[PDB]
Design a protein around this ligand. Sequence first.
Ligand SMILES: O=C(NCc1cccs1)[C@@H]1CN(c2nc3cc(Cl)ccc3o2)CCN1C(=O)[C@@H](CC1CCCCC1)NC1CCCCC1
Length: 241
Amino acid sequence: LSCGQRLRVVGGLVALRGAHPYIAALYWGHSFCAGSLIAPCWVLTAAHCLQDRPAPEDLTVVLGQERRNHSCEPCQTLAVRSYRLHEAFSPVSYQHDLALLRLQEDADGSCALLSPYVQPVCLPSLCQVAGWGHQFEGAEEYASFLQEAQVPFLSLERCSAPDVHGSSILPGMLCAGFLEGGTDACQGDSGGPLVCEDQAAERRLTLQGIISWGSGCGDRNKPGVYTDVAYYLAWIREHTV
Ligand SMILES: O=C(NCc1cccs1)[C@@H]1CN(c2nc3cc(Cl)ccc3o2)CCN1C(=O)[C@@H](CC1CCCCC1)NC1CCCCC1
């Protein structure tokens, strides 16, 4: 497939190399974020990750990773040429929480080299959240292996009920997870993916959300909040020329 091809977090399971071939790991200083490869030279992440504005030269993007802490021969380490946060990102409400990283091309003009382990994810227009974050709130460390958990979409009417997130759910946000709790994104999953298998297009992986924020991790009535990728489609297409 052109995109969304696949080879093979609280309450998740290990996701081995090739399970999420589009997932990007972003490193700088003592900081970390995840993202999604949406094209050979582009990675979609959360804007809140880069709000302190590190220099693009201080960032490292790693594609093909399984373990966050292992050096790996087929993994691709790329420099970041530049990045663009959404111009309307609000550090107070987290509305418009999205950012694009332009990867540094080599002499020939290539960035990510596609392989069974590195593939772009499809853009939108059976769901899972993935990341290397804390496996529970209060964990002293990030997960060593990538984790994956199945979560369903929750309607805006249910996510904005007063006992859930109320008036904090704004245009551009979506919720996924369970009101019972147990399975969710957590601290350290920032910028990572919420992908769904597209039944209309051969079950290809389609990026529906970007891990943005939550009240706790896996708490009752507090599901994870994500940036609605479909809502920002024209912005992403405009800024990825
Ligand atoms: O953890 C976050 N996102 C990932 C998650 C997805 C689902 C659950 S956590 C974000 C961003 N963050 C963050 N810290 C980072 C550290 C690094 Cl190194 C990189 C990105 C980072 O993003 C710290 C605060 N935060 C939050 O979500 C705050 C709430 C926001 C709401 C809007 C206003 C600011 C606070 N609560 C978490 C609940 C779980 C435990 C931590 C607090």
